[PDB]
Amino acid sequence: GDSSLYIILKKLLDFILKTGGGFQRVRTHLYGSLLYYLQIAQRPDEPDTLEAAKKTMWERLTAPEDVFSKLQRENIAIIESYGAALMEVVCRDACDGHEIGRMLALALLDRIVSVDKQQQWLLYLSNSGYLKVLVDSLVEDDRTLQSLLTPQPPLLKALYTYESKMAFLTRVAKIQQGALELLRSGVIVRLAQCQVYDMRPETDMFIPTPVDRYRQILLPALQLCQVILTSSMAQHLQAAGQVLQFLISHSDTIQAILRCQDVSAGSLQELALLTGIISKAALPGILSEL
Amino acid sequence: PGRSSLDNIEMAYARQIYIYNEKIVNGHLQPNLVDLCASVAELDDKSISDMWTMVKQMTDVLVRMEFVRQALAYLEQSYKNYTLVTVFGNLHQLGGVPGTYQLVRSFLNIKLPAPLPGLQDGEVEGHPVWALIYYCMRCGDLLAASQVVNRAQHQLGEFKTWFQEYMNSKDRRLSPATENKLRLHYRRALRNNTDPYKRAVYCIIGRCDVTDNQSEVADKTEDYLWLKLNQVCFDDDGTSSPQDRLTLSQFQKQLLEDYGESHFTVPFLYFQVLFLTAQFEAAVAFLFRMERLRCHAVHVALVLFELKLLLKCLRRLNFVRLLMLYTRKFESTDPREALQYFYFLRDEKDSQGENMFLRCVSELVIESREFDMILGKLENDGSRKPGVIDKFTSDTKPIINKVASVAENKGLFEEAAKLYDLAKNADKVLELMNKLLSPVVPQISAPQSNKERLKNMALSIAERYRAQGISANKFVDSTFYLLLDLITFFDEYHSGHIDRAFDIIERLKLVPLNQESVEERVAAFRNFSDEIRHNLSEVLLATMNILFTQFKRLKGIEDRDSQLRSQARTLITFAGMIPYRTSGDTNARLVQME
């Protein structure tokens, strides 16, 4: 049992909240340990495992096992307290310093993220901070993909972080309350500002690599939009209208995406699916275009 | 929206590759390009379409395969076709015979050289001779052009000589002699003056002035290309040390500079210029742009590919990867189609590509996890029913082991069992199988519909393998049957049939029905295989249940209550002896009493 590990997890949270450590270097270490701990606790299991455990509890027909759920609950309580405090510290920190330590802190934020999805965090986190900052950072994401060539190097830093940021955004969108916060932050606006979509990637390093990269950005952002759309009530709701505007305004890209090949094709294929999901999920983009 | 438009298109294209794969397999003579040309006719494709015709002319247009020669031929034939069509439609019907010369006279006379005739040509007997020679040349009818000059009535006659030998040879008229002399005359006399067509003929035939362009009579973009193609001199260019050499490479670069897609306007036409110019890579990349229709670029590449080009994904040209990336879009949804596309990779025959193909397929199987579709399915003896890949064939066993082991990591049991069946590791299958059925047996009750799952799976394999030349270990099979027997006991346990359950449980020969032989049941307990050792808990308590319910004290003659009573007793002694080696529910006691 990684019970012994639990104590270290507590110490880590303590130090972070305290934000002692002149070195972000120190905090990077704390973030790394926390990340492993969160990951370790839930060995890759998916909703099926949870459903099986619930049934067994079903009810305690005899002696049940509910060990992993119990462990997750304890982790989440500890984390909550310490949490509000530490969320503040973790996000601010974020930005700066450490573009480095960043790779570590964004990964920590994402793991944490699943668990403690649901709950808790959405409220806290919401507010603050994050949203505002993260949406603005979408705009700047577009700019950051170009700056991407330069910095291929400084890339190492940022791939660990930028990808982590997209993931964090996608995860928030997966749930109702999270999607609401992102959308409130003016997601569509930042995306319009990034101008990632309102262009043609082909227009324009070995060229297939750049296409893979650009399309890659498009697939994640597109997933974030689709997730935000569906995650609310995609119908009469306001969300449906916003997504439709997204499609029409960035039409012809959707159409253009539909045919061709490579790993680039693979990325293209995923992008195509993502648009399709956006289409049906909304009022059928086609349906709207009666 | 929904865009059934593309999906329909996707399917149409997929259909065509599919037929192409059938032909390759069946040694057929199905043309890819004619097939696109047929579909492409409809619209916007009127560009893409012309592109396809260009490729098709190339069909077996090797015929050797000279870059500029073929490009020239395409342009020349196109012009000829254009000429024939104009003639083929009213008039006179032209007065004379249909000879090629006359057709061109018609083009020159009827077509737009005259609104109502006139200006700056040299004309004899109503005919611009130089224009004629130029157009005949344009058509590719060099011989006729030469003849016209012969008959000409002209006085630059030295040129006449230089035309004939240009014609005689490979058309790279290279006399170690005069060419130099012709050039001087051009510069002095011809260059600063004359009738546009005359200049064209001199310049083009001579390769007189490498700074390039013909003033008055370049009327079309293709005219523009054709002229340039005529000018380049590939063979023995390196030999001879003047710098009046113009190469395909040089031509290609000019097309790039700025001339740009915009410059080649009809952007529509730019595509064609790229193919003609030999910029295949650029051509795919360019097709790669509008909506490039990743789909279109992919297929065109496929077509160049059939042609045996590609001689060394927005910007990623390699054929394997171009195909692979294309697959990414549809692979999850349409794994079959993905296979069809990956298969094309072999079209480039050679190792490397072959492995790339294999790796791609391997990669497809893994993570798509569409095992049945991709790998195969159910024996009913009769080996595998082939998966799509198997139809293509070969390395399939090694992929299976790889996938199966991976399944083991993930713990995706069922997939593993499925994979091992294909692997034909019969013993392995049953063993994994015994494990699956074994747990799920121990647990708590209320399950087991009579139609589908691990139990059902159990039934499938036993019926299936055991009769037929069974390769499995006897031990392995034995536990298998026991698990099945226990399961049938379950079916009948509840759903009534109390009496039947005892009979079957006793048959198991696991639990002491007889005397105090309960202890022998101890001795034989530790020996028990791990799978059964686990199951016993329910065997007991099932017994004390039926035993209880059946032996409900009856109302108001032979009633031997004593048995079905002794059975409980022996069972309890049994349970009493192994409670520690059991989960910890001697709540047999609750059922035991009342």
Coordinates of C-alpha atoms in Angstrom, one line a residue, chain B residues 153-591:
Chain B
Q153 CA 9.4 31.5 -101.1
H154 CA 11.6 33.3 -98.5
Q155 CA 15.0 34.6 -98.4
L156 CA 16.5 33.8 -95.0
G157 CA 17.1 30.4 -96.6
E158 CA 20.2 29.6 -94.5
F159 CA 17.6 29.2 -91.7
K160 CA 15.8 26.7 -93.9
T161 CA 18.9 24.5 -93.7
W162 CA 19.0 24.8 -89.9
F163 CA 15.4 23.8 -89.7
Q164 CA 16.2 20.6 -91.6
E165 CA 18.6 18.6 -89.4
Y166 CA 16.9 20.0 -86.3
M167 CA 14.1 17.9 -87.6
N168 CA 16.4 15.1 -88.8
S169 CA 17.9 14.5 -85.4
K170 CA 16.4 13.9 -82.0
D171 CA 15.3 17.5 -82.3
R172 CA 18.2 18.6 -80.3
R173 CA 19.8 19.7 -83.6
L174 CA 23.4 19.9 -82.5
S175 CA 25.8 20.3 -85.3
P176 CA 29.3 20.8 -84.1
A177 CA 29.1 23.1 -87.1
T178 CA 26.7 26.0 -87.7
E179 CA 24.5 26.9 -84.8
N180 CA 26.9 29.6 -84.0
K181 CA 26.4 31.1 -87.5
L182 CA 22.6 31.0 -87.1
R183 CA 22.9 32.7 -83.7
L184 CA 24.9 35.6 -85.1
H185 CA 22.4 36.2 -87.8
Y186 CA 19.6 36.2 -85.3
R187 CA 21.2 38.8 -83.2
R188 CA 22.1 41.1 -86.0
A189 CA 19.3 40.7 -88.5
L190 CA 16.3 39.1 -86.8
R191 CA 16.4 40.2 -83.2
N192 CA 15.8 43.8 -83.7
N193 CA 12.8 44.0 -86.1
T194 CA 10.7 41.3 -87.7
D195 CA 7.4 39.5 -87.8
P196 CA 6.6 38.0 -84.5
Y197 CA 6.1 34.4 -85.8
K198 CA 9.3 34.4 -87.7
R199 CA 11.1 35.5 -84.6
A200 CA 9.4 32.7 -82.7
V201 CA 10.5 30.1 -85.1
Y202 CA 14.1 31.3 -85.1
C203 CA 14.2 31.7 -81.4
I204 CA 12.6 28.4 -80.5
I205 CA 14.3 26.2 -83.0
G206 CA 17.7 27.9 -82.5
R207 CA 17.5 28.4 -78.8
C208 CA 18.9 31.7 -80.0
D209 CA 18.5 34.1 -77.1
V210 CA 18.2 32.4 -73.7
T211 CA 16.8 35.5 -72.2
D212 CA 13.3 34.3 -72.6
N213 CA 10.0 35.4 -74.0
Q214 CA 8.2 35.9 -77.3
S215 CA 6.8 39.3 -77.8
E216 CA 3.6 39.2 -79.7
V217 CA 2.5 35.7 -80.0
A218 CA 2.4 34.1 -76.6
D219 CA -1.3 33.9 -76.2
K220 CA -1.8 31.2 -73.6
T221 CA -0.4 30.0 -70.4
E222 CA 0.2 26.7 -72.0
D223 CA 1.7 28.5 -75.0
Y224 CA 3.9 30.0 -72.3
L225 CA 4.9 26.6 -70.9
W226 CA 5.4 25.0 -74.3
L227 CA 7.7 27.7 -75.4
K228 CA 9.8 27.3 -72.3
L229 CA 9.9 23.5 -72.6
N230 CA 11.1 23.8 -76.2
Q231 CA 14.0 26.0 -75.1
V232 CA 15.6 23.7 -72.5
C233 CA 18.3 21.4 -73.8
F234 CA 18.8 18.4 -71.6
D235 CA 21.0 16.1 -73.6
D236 CA 24.7 16.9 -74.1
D237 CA 24.0 20.2 -72.5
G238 CA 26.8 19.7 -70.2
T239 CA 29.0 19.0 -73.1
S240 CA 30.0 22.0 -75.1
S241 CA 31.2 24.8 -73.0
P242 CA 28.9 27.8 -73.8
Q243 CA 26.6 29.1 -71.2
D244 CA 23.6 29.0 -73.4
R245 CA 22.2 26.1 -71.6
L246 CA 18.8 26.3 -70.1
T247 CA 17.8 23.4 -67.9
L248 CA 14.6 22.0 -66.5
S249 CA 15.9 22.9 -63.1
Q250 CA 16.3 26.5 -64.3
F251 CA 12.8 26.4 -65.7
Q252 CA 11.4 24.9 -62.6
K253 CA 12.9 27.7 -60.5
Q254 CA 11.5 30.4 -62.6
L255 CA 8.1 28.9 -62.1
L256 CA 8.7 29.1 -58.4
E257 CA 10.0 32.6 -58.1
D258 CA 7.0 34.9 -58.3
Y259 CA 6.1 33.0 -60.7
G260 CA 3.8 31.9 -58.0
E261 CA 0.5 30.3 -58.1
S262 CA -1.1 33.7 -58.4
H263 CA 0.8 34.4 -61.5
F264 CA -0.3 31.2 -63.1
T265 CA -3.8 32.4 -63.2
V266 CA -6.6 30.3 -64.4
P267 CA -5.0 29.9 -59.4
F268 CA -6.6 26.9 -61.0
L269 CA -4.0 26.1 -63.7
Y270 CA -1.0 26.3 -61.4
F271 CA -1.5 22.7 -60.5
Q272 CA -1.0 21.6 -64.1
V273 CA 2.1 23.7 -64.5
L274 CA 3.6 21.9 -61.5
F275 CA 2.9 18.5 -63.0
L276 CA 4.2 19.4 -66.4
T277 CA 7.3 21.1 -64.9
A278 CA 8.1 18.0 -62.9
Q279 CA 7.5 19.5 -59.6
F280 CA 5.5 16.5 -58.4
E281 CA 6.3 17.2 -54.8
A282 CA 5.3 20.7 -55.1
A283 CA 2.2 19.6 -57.1
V284 CA 1.0 17.4 -54.3
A285 CA 1.8 20.1 -51.8
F286 CA -0.1 22.6 -53.9
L287 CA -3.0 20.3 -54.3
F288 CA -2.5 20.1 -50.6
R289 CA -3.8 23.7 -50.1
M290 CA -7.6 24.8 -50.9
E291 CA -10.4 22.3 -50.3
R292 CA -6.6 21.1 -50.9
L293 CA -8.8 18.3 -50.3
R294 CA -6.4 16.3 -48.4
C295 CA -8.3 13.6 -50.1
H296 CA -7.5 14.9 -53.5
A297 CA -3.8 15.3 -52.7
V298 CA -3.7 11.8 -51.3
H299 CA -5.2 10.2 -54.4
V300 CA -3.2 12.2 -56.9
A301 CA -0.1 11.1 -55.0
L302 CA -1.5 7.6 -55.3
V303 CA -1.7 8.2 -59.1
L304 CA 1.8 9.6 -59.4
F305 CA 2.8 6.6 -57.3
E306 CA 1.3 4.1 -59.7
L307 CA 3.4 5.9 -62.4
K308 CA 6.4 5.0 -60.3
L309 CA 7.3 8.5 -59.4
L310 CA 8.0 9.5 -55.8
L311 CA 11.6 8.7 -56.5
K312 CA 13.0 10.4 -53.5
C313 CA -0.1 16.1 -43.2
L314 CA -0.2 19.4 -45.0
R315 CA 3.5 19.4 -46.0
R316 CA 4.6 15.8 -45.6
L317 CA 5.3 14.3 -49.0
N318 CA 6.5 10.7 -48.3
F319 CA 4.0 8.3 -49.8
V320 CA 3.8 6.1 -46.8
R321 CA 3.2 8.9 -44.4
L322 CA 0.9 10.7 -46.8
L323 CA -1.3 7.6 -46.8
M324 CA -0.9 7.0 -43.1
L325 CA -1.9 10.5 -42.1
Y326 CA -4.9 10.3 -44.4
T327 CA -5.9 7.2 -42.5
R328 CA -5.8 9.1 -39.2
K329 CA -9.0 10.8 -40.1
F330 CA -11.1 7.7 -40.7
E331 CA -9.2 4.9 -39.0
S332 CA -11.2 4.5 -35.9
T333 CA -14.5 4.7 -37.7
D334 CA -13.5 2.8 -40.9
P335 CA -10.7 0.5 -40.2
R336 CA -11.4 -1.5 -43.3
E337 CA -10.9 1.5 -45.5
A338 CA -7.7 2.3 -43.6
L339 CA -6.3 -1.1 -44.5
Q340 CA -7.1 -0.5 -48.2
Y341 CA -5.1 2.7 -48.1
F342 CA -2.2 1.3 -46.2
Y343 CA -1.9 -1.5 -48.7
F344 CA -1.1 1.1 -51.4
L345 CA 2.2 1.7 -49.7
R346 CA 3.5 -1.6 -51.2
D347 CA 2.7 -0.1 -54.6
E348 CA 6.2 1.4 -54.2
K349 CA 8.0 -1.9 -54.5
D350 CA 11.1 -2.2 -52.5
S351 CA 12.1 -3.0 -48.9
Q352 CA 11.8 -0.1 -46.5
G353 CA 8.4 0.8 -48.0
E354 CA 7.4 -2.7 -47.4
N355 CA 8.3 -2.5 -43.7
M356 CA 6.7 0.9 -43.5
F357 CA 3.5 -0.8 -44.8
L358 CA 3.9 -3.6 -42.2
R359 CA 4.5 -1.2 -39.4
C360 CA 1.6 0.9 -40.4
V361 CA -0.7 -2.0 -40.4
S362 CA 0.8 -3.2 -37.1
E363 CA 0.2 0.3 -35.8
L364 CA -3.3 0.2 -37.1
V365 CA -4.2 -3.0 -35.3
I366 CA -2.7 -1.8 -32.1
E367 CA -4.6 1.1 -30.5
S368 CA -7.5 0.7 -32.9
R369 CA -8.1 -2.6 -31.3
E370 CA -10.4 -3.7 -34.1
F371 CA -9.2 -7.2 -33.8
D372 CA -12.1 -9.1 -35.3
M373 CA -12.3 -6.9 -38.3
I374 CA -8.6 -6.6 -38.8
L375 CA -7.3 -10.0 -37.6
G376 CA -10.1 -12.5 -38.1
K377 CA -12.6 -14.4 -36.0
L378 CA -14.3 -17.7 -34.7
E379 CA -13.0 -21.1 -35.8
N380 CA -15.9 -23.6 -35.8
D381 CA -13.0 -25.7 -36.7
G382 CA -12.4 -24.2 -40.1
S383 CA -9.4 -22.1 -39.0
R384 CA -9.9 -18.4 -39.0
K385 CA -12.5 -16.6 -40.9
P386 CA -10.2 -14.1 -42.5
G387 CA -9.9 -10.6 -41.4
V388 CA -9.4 -7.8 -43.9
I389 CA -5.7 -7.8 -43.5
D390 CA -5.4 -11.6 -43.9
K391 CA -7.0 -11.2 -47.3
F392 CA -3.9 -9.1 -48.0
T393 CA -1.9 -11.7 -46.0
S394 CA 1.3 -12.8 -44.3
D395 CA 2.8 -11.5 -41.1
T396 CA -0.2 -11.8 -38.9
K397 CA 0.9 -14.4 -36.4
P398 CA 3.6 -12.2 -35.0
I399 CA 1.3 -9.2 -34.8
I400 CA -1.2 -11.3 -32.9
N401 CA 1.3 -12.3 -30.3
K402 CA 2.3 -8.7 -29.9
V403 CA -1.2 -7.5 -29.6
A404 CA -2.1 -10.3 -27.2
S405 CA 0.7 -9.7 -24.9
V406 CA -0.3 -6.1 -24.8
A407 CA -3.8 -7.1 -24.0
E408 CA -2.2 -9.0 -21.1
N409 CA -0.6 -5.8 -19.8
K410 CA -3.8 -3.9 -19.9
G411 CA -5.6 -6.9 -18.6
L412 CA -8.0 -6.7 -21.4
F413 CA -9.1 -10.2 -21.0
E414 CA -11.5 -11.4 -23.8
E415 CA -9.2 -9.6 -26.2
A416 CA -6.4 -11.8 -25.0
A417 CA -8.6 -14.9 -25.3
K418 CA -9.7 -13.8 -28.7
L419 CA -6.1 -13.1 -29.8
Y420 CA -4.8 -16.4 -28.5
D421 CA -7.5 -18.3 -30.4
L422 CA -6.2 -16.7 -33.6
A423 CA -2.7 -17.5 -32.3
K424 CA -3.9 -21.0 -32.0
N425 CA -2.4 -21.3 -28.6
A426 CA -5.2 -23.6 -27.5
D427 CA -3.7 -24.4 -24.1
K428 CA -3.2 -20.8 -23.4
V429 CA -6.7 -19.9 -24.3
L430 CA -8.3 -22.4 -22.0
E431 CA -6.0 -21.4 -19.1
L432 CA -6.9 -17.7 -19.4
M433 CA -10.4 -18.8 -19.8
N434 CA -10.4 -20.9 -16.7
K435 CA -9.3 -17.9 -14.8
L436 CA -12.0 -15.7 -16.2
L437 CA -14.7 -18.2 -15.5
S438 CA -13.2 -19.1 -12.2
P439 CA -13.5 -15.7 -10.7
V440 CA -17.0 -14.4 -11.3
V441 CA -17.9 -17.8 -10.1
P442 CA -17.0 -17.0 -6.5
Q443 CA -19.0 -13.8 -5.5
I444 CA -22.6 -13.1 -4.6
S445 CA -25.7 -14.3 -6.5
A446 CA -28.2 -12.9 -8.9
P447 CA -26.8 -13.2 -12.4
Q448 CA -26.2 -15.4 -15.3
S449 CA -28.8 -14.9 -17.9
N450 CA -28.8 -18.0 -20.1
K451 CA -27.4 -16.2 -23.1
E452 CA -24.0 -14.4 -23.3
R453 CA -20.8 -13.8 -21.3
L454 CA -17.8 -15.5 -19.8
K455 CA -19.9 -18.6 -19.0
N456 CA -21.2 -18.5 -22.5
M457 CA -17.7 -18.1 -23.6
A458 CA -16.8 -21.1 -21.6
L459 CA -19.4 -23.1 -23.4
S460 CA -18.2 -22.0 -26.8
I461 CA -14.6 -23.0 -26.3
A462 CA -15.3 -26.4 -24.8
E463 CA -17.8 -27.6 -27.4
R464 CA -15.5 -26.1 -29.9
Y465 CA -12.0 -27.4 -29.1
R466 CA -12.5 -30.5 -27.1
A467 CA -14.1 -32.6 -29.7
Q468 CA -11.5 -31.7 -32.2
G469 CA -8.0 -33.2 -31.8
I470 CA -7.8 -31.2 -28.6
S471 CA -4.2 -29.9 -28.1
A472 CA -4.9 -28.8 -24.5
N473 CA -3.5 -30.4 -21.4
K474 CA -5.8 -32.8 -19.7
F475 CA -5.5 -31.0 -16.5
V476 CA -6.4 -27.7 -18.1
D477 CA -9.5 -29.3 -19.7
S478 CA -10.5 -31.0 -16.4
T479 CA -10.7 -27.8 -14.5
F480 CA -12.6 -26.4 -17.4
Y481 CA -15.3 -29.0 -17.2
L482 CA -15.5 -28.6 -13.5
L483 CA -16.1 -24.9 -13.9
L484 CA -18.8 -25.6 -16.4
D485 CA -20.4 -28.2 -14.1
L486 CA -20.5 -25.7 -11.3
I487 CA -22.1 -23.2 -13.6
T488 CA -24.9 -25.5 -14.7
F489 CA -25.4 -26.1 -11.0
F490 CA -25.9 -22.3 -10.7
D491 CA -28.4 -22.2 -13.5
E492 CA -30.5 -24.7 -11.8
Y493 CA -29.8 -23.3 -8.3
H494 CA -32.7 -21.0 -7.8
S495 CA -35.2 -21.1 -10.6
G496 CA -36.2 -24.0 -8.3
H497 CA -35.0 -27.4 -8.9
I498 CA -33.6 -27.9 -5.4
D499 CA -33.4 -31.6 -5.8
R500 CA -31.4 -31.4 -9.0
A501 CA -28.8 -29.1 -7.5
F502 CA -27.8 -31.7 -4.9
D503 CA -27.4 -34.4 -7.4
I504 CA -25.1 -32.3 -9.6
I505 CA -23.1 -31.0 -6.7
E506 CA -22.5 -34.5 -5.4
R507 CA -21.3 -35.5 -8.9
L508 CA -18.6 -32.9 -8.6
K509 CA -17.0 -35.2 -6.1
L510 CA -15.7 -32.1 -4.4
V511 CA -17.9 -32.1 -1.2
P512 CA -18.3 -35.0 1.2
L513 CA -21.8 -36.4 0.9
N514 CA -21.0 -39.7 2.4
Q515 CA -19.7 -40.2 5.9
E516 CA -17.3 -38.3 8.0
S517 CA -15.0 -38.6 4.9
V518 CA -15.1 -34.8 5.3
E519 CA -11.5 -35.0 6.4
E520 CA -10.4 -36.8 3.3
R521 CA -12.0 -33.8 1.7
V522 CA -9.5 -31.8 3.8
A523 CA -6.6 -33.9 2.5
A524 CA -7.9 -33.3 -0.9
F525 CA -8.3 -29.6 -0.7
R526 CA -4.9 -28.2 -0.4
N527 CA -4.1 -30.3 -3.5
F528 CA -6.9 -28.5 -5.4
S529 CA -6.0 -26.2 -8.2
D530 CA -6.0 -22.5 -7.4
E531 CA -9.0 -22.0 -9.6
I532 CA -11.3 -24.4 -7.7
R533 CA -9.8 -23.8 -4.3
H534 CA -11.3 -20.4 -4.6
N535 CA -14.8 -21.6 -5.7
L536 CA -15.5 -23.9 -2.8
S537 CA -17.0 -21.2 -0.6
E538 CA -20.2 -21.0 -2.8
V539 CA -20.2 -24.8 -3.3
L540 CA -20.8 -25.0 0.4
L541 CA -23.8 -22.9 1.3
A542 CA -25.4 -23.8 -2.0
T543 CA -25.5 -27.2 -0.5
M544 CA -26.7 -25.8 2.7
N545 CA -29.7 -24.0 1.1
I546 CA -31.2 -26.6 -1.1
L547 CA -30.6 -28.9 1.8
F548 CA -32.5 -26.4 4.0
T549 CA -35.3 -25.5 1.6
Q550 CA -35.8 -29.1 0.3
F551 CA -35.8 -30.2 3.9
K552 CA -38.4 -27.8 4.9
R553 CA -40.2 -29.7 7.6
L554 CA -43.0 -31.3 5.9
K555 CA -46.7 -31.4 6.7
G556 CA -48.3 -34.7 7.7
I557 CA -45.1 -43.4 4.3
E558 CA -41.4 -43.2 3.8
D559 CA -39.7 -39.9 4.5
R560 CA -36.0 -40.2 4.9
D561 CA -35.2 -36.8 6.3
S562 CA -32.1 -38.4 7.8
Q563 CA -30.3 -38.1 4.5
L564 CA -30.0 -34.6 3.2
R565 CA -29.4 -34.0 6.9
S566 CA -26.3 -36.1 7.2
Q567 CA -25.1 -34.3 4.2
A568 CA -25.3 -31.0 6.0
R569 CA -23.5 -32.5 8.9
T570 CA -20.6 -33.7 6.9
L571 CA -20.5 -30.4 5.0
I572 CA -20.4 -28.5 8.2
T573 CA -17.5 -30.5 9.6
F574 CA -15.9 -29.8 6.2
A575 CA -16.5 -26.1 6.6
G576 CA -15.4 -26.2 10.1
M577 CA -12.1 -27.7 9.1
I578 CA -11.4 -25.1 6.4
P579 CA -12.7 -21.7 7.5
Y580 CA -9.3 -20.2 7.7
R581 CA -8.5 -21.2 4.2
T582 CA -11.7 -19.7 3.2
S583 CA -13.0 -16.1 2.8
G584 CA -14.5 -16.0 6.2
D585 CA -18.1 -16.7 6.1
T586 CA -19.2 -19.5 8.2
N587 CA -22.5 -18.0 8.0
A588 CA -23.5 -21.4 6.8
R589 CA -24.6 -21.4 10.4
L590 CA -27.4 -19.0 9.7
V591 CA -28.8 -21.1 6.9

